[PDB]
């Protein structure tokens, strides 16, 4: 019976992919922290749409879904 | 379910007095009553014979 917010609290500092709603782009990286709006911070992220990205901030409105 | 009948075309001996599809002048009647319907007109035909 897990809800979304404890699900993000359980996914901290685990490898998580996040699919944005636009190009079917997903950022694969270790989650750092989340806001109350589910803003995302990531370390060692990689952009799949192939690249490697050091640190990332993702705004809440553009994400489609979050997976592990 | 329902048959479409033209007592004018029937009493005039013409062929198409009935059809399954809806046409301009026909009257919808129950299919089982169709035979019954013929009975109701026979005396009229009997008067013309």
């Amino acid at each position: 019976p897990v809800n979304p917010k404890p699900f993000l609290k359980g996914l901290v500092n685990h490898r998580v992919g996040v699919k944005l709603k636009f190009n079917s782009t997903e950022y694969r990286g270790t989650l750092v922290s989340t806001d109350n709006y589910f803003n995302l911070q990531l370390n060692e992220a990689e952009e799949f749409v192939h690249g490697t990205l050091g640190e990332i901030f993702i705004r809440c409105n553009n994400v489609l879904y979050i997976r592990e | 379910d329902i048959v479409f009948v033209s007592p004018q075309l029937y009493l005039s001996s013409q062929e198409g007095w009935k059809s399954d599809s809806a046409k301009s002048g026909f009257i919808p009647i129950l299919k089982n009553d169709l035979q019954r319907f013929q009975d109701s007109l026979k005396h009229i035909v009997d008067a013309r014979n």
């Binding site: 922290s33 806001d35 803003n39 911070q41 990332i56 901030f57 | -």
Partner: protein, 101 residues
């Protein structure tokens, strides 16, 4: 805990925490350390710049902005660059913001 219960100062401590410890701490640490950031908008072109200020809504004030936008028609591409000294960016357009090494 919902926001309507808290008092006027508890919201100030909450925003101070969210900026200091939270996702937007990526931007905050970028403002203090003078590290240039890359920003992708939803308009599909990307500014390489330096953050003088930021805010809750993510709208932020920038200095030495360099905008990069490409366009293609029938698979004919051209890359265009546009330089700006100082800028104010409304935060609803942005999607991803990364902190350069």
């Amino acid at each position: 805990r919902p926001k309507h219960e808290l008092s006027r100062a508890e919201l100030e401590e909450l925003e101070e925490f969210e900026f200091k410890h939270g996702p937007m701490s990526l931007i905050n640490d970028a403002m203090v350390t003078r590290t240039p950031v890359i920003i992708s908008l939803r308009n599909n072109h990307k500014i390489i710049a330096r953050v003088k200020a930021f805010d809750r809504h993510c709208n932020m004030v920038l200095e030495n902005v360099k905008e990069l936008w490409t366009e293609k028609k029938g698979k004919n591409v051209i890359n265009r660059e546009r330089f700006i000294s100082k800028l104010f960016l409304r935060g609803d357009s942005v999607i991803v913001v990364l902190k350069t090494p």
